[PDB]
Design an enzyme around this catalytic site. Structure first.
Site, PDB file in Angstrom:
ATOM      1  N   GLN A   1      -1.047 -38.299 -26.535  1.00 25.50           N
ATOM      2  CA  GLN A   1       0.088 -38.180 -25.557  1.00 25.50           C
ATOM      3  C   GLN A   1       0.014 -36.906 -24.773  1.00 25.50           C
ATOM      4  O   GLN A   1       0.724 -36.767 -23.769  1.00 25.50           O
ATOM      5  CB  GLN A   1       1.444 -38.102 -26.307  1.00 25.50           C
ATOM      6  CG  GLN A   1       1.757 -39.420 -27.003  1.00 25.50           C
ATOM      7  CD  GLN A   1       3.125 -39.338 -27.661  1.00 25.50           C
ATOM      8  OE1 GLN A   1       3.211 -38.960 -28.805  1.00 25.50           O
ATOM      9  NE2 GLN A   1       4.234 -39.727 -26.914  1.00 25.50           N
TER      10      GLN A   1
ATOM     11  N   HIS B   1       4.456 -44.932 -36.121  1.00 23.54           N
ATOM     12  CA  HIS B   1       4.536 -44.861 -34.633  1.00 23.54           C
ATOM     13  C   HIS B   1       3.419 -43.932 -34.111  1.00 23.54           C
ATOM     14  O   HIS B   1       2.744 -44.276 -33.154  1.00 23.54           O
ATOM     15  CB  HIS B   1       5.929 -44.324 -34.204  1.00 23.54           C
ATOM     16  CG  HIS B   1       6.085 -44.146 -32.718  1.00 23.54           C
ATOM     17  ND1 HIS B   1       6.850 -44.983 -31.923  1.00 23.54           N
ATOM     18  CD2 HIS B   1       5.594 -43.174 -31.884  1.00 23.54           C
ATOM     19  CE1 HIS B   1       6.764 -44.567 -30.642  1.00 23.54           C
ATOM     20  NE2 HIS B   1       6.033 -43.460 -30.601  1.00 23.54           N
ATOM     21  N   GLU B   2       3.288 -42.743 -34.733  1.00 20.14           N
ATOM     22  CA  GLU B   2       2.260 -41.802 -34.241  1.00 20.14           C
ATOM     23  C   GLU B   2       0.865 -42.354 -34.542  1.00 20.14           C
ATOM     24  O   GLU B   2      -0.028 -42.182 -33.732  1.00 20.14           O
ATOM     25  CB  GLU B   2       2.410 -40.419 -34.893  1.00 20.14           C
ATOM     26  CG  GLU B   2       3.794 -39.755 -34.617  1.00 20.14           C
ATOM     27  CD  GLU B   2       4.280 -39.935 -33.207  1.00 20.14           C
ATOM     28  OE1 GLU B   2       3.452 -39.967 -32.280  1.00 20.14           O
ATOM     29  OE2 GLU B   2       5.535 -40.078 -33.013  1.00 20.14           O
TER      30      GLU B   2
ATOM     31  N   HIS C   1      -0.371 -44.553 -31.928  1.00 16.08           N
ATOM     32  CA  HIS C   1      -0.981 -43.829 -30.747  1.00 16.08           C
ATOM     33  C   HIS C   1      -2.508 -43.522 -30.917  1.00 16.08           C
ATOM     34  O   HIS C   1      -3.278 -43.512 -29.933  1.00 16.08           O
ATOM     35  CB  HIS C   1      -0.268 -42.502 -30.468  1.00 16.08           C
ATOM     36  CG  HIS C   1       1.018 -42.657 -29.725  1.00 16.08           C
ATOM     37  ND1 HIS C   1       1.050 -43.092 -28.434  1.00 16.08           N
ATOM     38  CD2 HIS C   1       2.318 -42.364 -30.058  1.00 16.08           C
ATOM     39  CE1 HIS C   1       2.301 -43.060 -27.971  1.00 16.08           C
ATOM     40  NE2 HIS C   1       3.092 -42.658 -28.941  1.00 16.08           N
TER      41      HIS C   1
ATOM     42  N   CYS D   1      10.048 -43.375 -27.046  1.00 16.65           N
ATOM     43  CA  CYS D   1       8.700 -42.702 -26.995  1.00 16.65           C
ATOM     44  C   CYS D   1       8.834 -41.608 -25.959  1.00 16.65           C
ATOM     45  O   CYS D   1       9.380 -41.821 -24.984  1.00 16.65           O
ATOM     46  CB  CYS D   1       7.539 -43.686 -26.573  1.00 16.65           C
ATOM     47  SG  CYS D   1       5.669 -43.340 -26.657  1.00 16.65           S
ATOM     48  N   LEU D   2       8.272 -40.430 -26.176  1.00 18.51           N
ATOM     49  CA  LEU D   2       8.256 -39.451 -25.071  1.00 18.51           C
ATOM     50  C   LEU D   2       7.250 -39.877 -23.957  1.00 18.51           C
ATOM     51  O   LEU D   2       7.362 -39.488 -22.819  1.00 18.51           O
ATOM     52  CB  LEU D   2       7.907 -38.073 -25.611  1.00 18.51           C
ATOM     53  CG  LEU D   2       8.602 -37.692 -26.891  1.00 18.51           C
ATOM     54  CD1 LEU D   2       7.970 -36.391 -27.348  1.00 18.51           C
ATOM     55  CD2 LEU D   2      10.073 -37.453 -26.693  1.00 18.51           C
TER      56      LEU D   2
ATOM     57  N   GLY E   1       8.117 -36.926 -33.509  1.00 19.51           N
ATOM     58  CA  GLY E   1       6.661 -37.012 -33.762  1.00 19.51           C
ATOM     59  C   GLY E   1       5.976 -36.845 -32.424  1.00 19.51           C
ATOM     60  O   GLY E   1       6.589 -37.101 -31.347  1.00 19.51           O
TER      61      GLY E   1
END
Ligand code: NA
Length: 167
Positions: free
Chosen positions: A51, A138-139, A142, A96-97, A46
């Site tokens: 991000q 999760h996304e 953000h 997480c990236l 994702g």
């Protein structure tokens, strides 16, 4: 074009993003394309627009091969809204990236519905469970300025991906 992913600690990840208001546009299509490209180069499942320092309610996600399955359909979702379909929580690994090299076990709702729009403006509404639903939660966090460490309950599970041996 591959975009730089900003890392935890960047205040831009802490913003509440405003809505996408250019559905069907060439500009939004180019942004989405960059996001899928960026998520691919980083091997994400994702990726949320903040991000890549783009302050908008927009995420991409999904994959055939990455541990996990039934592989989620590649999806770009604007103006996502989520609601749980039961109070049942499930623990599972997230990394997480924007948080490279780390992961923790995080509880998420096992079952959700999410609604929003595809980049061409058509509506999307789906029920999802398990890994699919976890990715979307999760996304979605953000887009409200929230990262996974603030959801950890068991800190024994939090650490570098190449060193954790938690079951
Ligand atoms: Na914030």
């Amino acid at each position: 074009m591959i975009r730089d992913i900003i890392r935890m600690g960047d205040k831009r990840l802490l913003r509440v993003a405003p809505q996408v208001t250019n559905l069907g546009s060439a500009e939004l299509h180019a942004l989405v394309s960059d996001m899928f490209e960026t998520m691919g180069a980083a091997h994400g499942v994702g990726l949320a627009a903040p991000q890549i320092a783009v302050d908008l309610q927009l995420m991409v996600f999904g994959f055939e091969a990455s541990p996990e399955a039934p592989a989620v359909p590649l999806t770009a979702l604007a103006n996502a809204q989520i609601e749980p379909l039961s109070d049942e929580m499930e623990n599972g690994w997230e990394g997480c990236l924007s948080i490279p090299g780390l992961r923790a076990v995080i509880p998420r709702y096992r079952y959700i519905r999410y609604r929003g729009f595809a980049p061409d403006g058509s509506p999307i509404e789906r029920e999802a469970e398990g890994f699919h639903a976890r990715v979307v939660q999760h996304e979605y966090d953000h887009l409200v300025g929230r990262l996974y460490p603030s959801r950890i309950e068991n800190f024994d599970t939090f650490g570098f991906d190449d060193v954790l041996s938690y079951d």
